[PDB]
Structures are given as structure tokens and as C-alpha cells.
């Protein structure tokens, strides 16, 4: 899985999210891929982690 736009809070632990919006899918490691109900769907991963995935 990869993420191009990763942002984190500046706390310890960091709380990071991938803000990538992708058509129809999120990255392969995403546990909560939130999509619009459009055609095509725009989706982004809601997961909060203490890391960023590598760039795509």
C-alpha cells in the first residue's frame, strides 16, 4: 500500500492519515475506505496510524 498525501498530528504517538482521494478504491491496507456514492466513487482511507505509507 502507498500514500501520496500523508499528514500527521504533531503529537506522540503521531496520528497520521492518508488523505489521498482515489477513484473507486483506497490503498490496499485500508481498513476503512470511505467512498462517495458517485460514479465513479471518490474514496479515501479513514485509517489513523502512527506512520505513513510509502509514497505511490
Amino acid at each position: 500500500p502507498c500514500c501520496d498525501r500523508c499528514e500527521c498530528t504533531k503529537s506522540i504517538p503521531p496520528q497520521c492519515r492518508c488523505s489521498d482521494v482515489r477513484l473507486n478504491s483506497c490503498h490496499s491496507a485500508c481498513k476503512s475506505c470511505a467512498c462517495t456514492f458517485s460514479i465513479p466513487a471518490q474514496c479515501f482511507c479513514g485509517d489513523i496510524n502512527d506512520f505513513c505509507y510509502k509514497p505511490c
Binding site: 500523508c6 506522540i12 488523505s19 479513514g46
Partner: protein, 223 residues
């Protein structure tokens, strides 16, 4: 703080360390019993450490006071980090002196170009990790919302601003969250989030304190 400088002991007397097991966020003392920090810095067991410089050595000017009340902004949204502000009431009032002092709340908002002082014990490396013993400081300007929104499309609300340097190299970083952005002696920002630290084109994002002054005052008055 990446690309900053050693402040000097107790030269930022309103800076506090929030400690719950370890230092995990900063905060700003706004009167003897209240600290402003980020909502995302809420954690169990917070001890507020005032008068710190070297957070790993008792130097003799510290006051360690347990947090007694957390008041996270009622509109804080962890999904967006909008309204990323929290008040912490100290269990007992801090003793205010040269080395422990409050910072004034703003009467008006700062805007692009305002020069500020950002401080904290956060990571000093943009790549990798190095955690300082002593407090670090960074002079940084507030940036145009155009630059801020361009850097973070769809994420910058009216309660945030960016500050720092688009060229990279100077920024707040992990461990700085909740800490102060002080501009002309007023607390205008709270370290909140960003894409990494000190990366080119990715300035730090900060909670816009001036939007919360009424809520802060009402909250302190009622709690």
C-alpha cells in the same frame, strides 16, 4: 522543532510540557490554572510540567502539576482536526514568576506575514528522529492561506493557518503539538499537524487561536 535554535532556559515561560509517561505534547499557560493545548493532545494521566528546559533533568525551576480537567472544544472533529483546541485546568494554580508565566490571548487575529515564535521539545529532524533535551524555538511567519490551502487541498479550515517556510527546513514536528505559536506576545496558534516536518512545500498547520478567545474565556469562567 526542526531548524530552530535552543531557546535558552525558561526564555519561553508560558511553554509547558504535557507528560503522561513521556513528553507527548506541549501547551501554553494562559493563566495560573489553565493551559491551552491541542484537542488531539488529550491523553489520560496528564501531568503538566511548567518551568521546564531540559525535560530529562530536574533543573530546579519546574513545577509539576496534575491536569484536573480537560475541556476539548465542543466542535473538535478528529476527522478534520477542525477546532483542535483543548483547555487543561491544573489541579492547583501554578506559581507565576520570571520562569513560569502566562501568555496573553489575542484580541485580534494575526494574518499572513505575521512573525511568530514557535517552540517545543518535538523532533528536530525532518527525516528520522532526534528528540532534544532542551526547549527549541523557531521564528516563523504566518503564510498566505493560498499557500496553505494549496499545500493541503481540502483540509484547511477557517480555524487553521499555516506558518513556516515553503522552502522547507524549518517547522514544528512530532512532540510539538499543542505548543505555542506566539506573535507579538499573543498566543495566535497551537501546533497541530502537517505533512511530515520541514518538508519543502508542506508548512506546518496550526489551530487559529483567535477564533476561540470567547469560548476560552467563557469556559475558564464556568469551570
Amino acid at each position: 522543532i526542526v531548524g530552530g535554535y535552543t531557546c535558552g532556559a525558561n526564555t519561553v515561560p508560558y511553554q509547558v510540557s504535557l507528560n503522561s509517561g513521556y513528553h507527548f505534547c506541549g501547551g501554553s499557560l494562559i493563566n495560573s490554572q489553565w493551559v491551552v493545548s491541542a484537542a488531539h493532545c488529550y491523553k489520560s494521566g496528564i501531568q503538566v510540567r511548567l518551568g521546564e528546559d531540559n525535560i530529562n533533568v530536574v533543573e530546579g525551576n519546574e513545577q509539576f502539576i496534575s491536569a484536573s480537567k480537560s475541556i476539548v472544544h465542543p466542535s473538535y472533529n478528529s476527522n478534520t482536526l477542525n477546532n483542535d483546541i483543548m483547555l487543561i485546568k491544573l489541579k492547583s494554580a501554578a506559581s507565576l514568576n520570571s520562569r513560569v508565566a502566562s501568555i496573553s490571548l489575542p484580541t485580534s487575529c494575526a494574518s499572513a506575514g505575521t512573525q511568530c515564535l514557535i517552540s517545543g521539545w518535538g523532533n528536530t529532524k525532518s527525516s528520522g528522529t532526534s528528540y532534544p533535551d532542551v526547549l527549541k524555538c523557531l521564528k516563523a511567519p504566518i503564510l498566505s492561506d493560498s499557500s496553505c490551502k494549496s499545500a493541503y487541498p481540502g483540509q484547511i479550515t477557517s480555524n487553521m493557518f499555516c506558518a513556516g517556510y515553503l522552502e522547507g527546513g524549518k517547522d514544528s514536528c512530532q512532540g510539538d503539538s499543542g505548543g505555542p505559536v506566539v506573535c507579538s506576545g499573543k498566543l495566535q496558534g497551537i501546533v497541530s499537524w502537517g505533512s511530515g516536518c520541514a518538508q519543502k512545500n508542506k508548512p506546518g498547520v496550526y489551530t487559529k487561536v483567535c477564533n476561540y478567545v470567547s469560548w476560552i474565556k467563557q469556559t475558564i469562567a464556568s469551570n
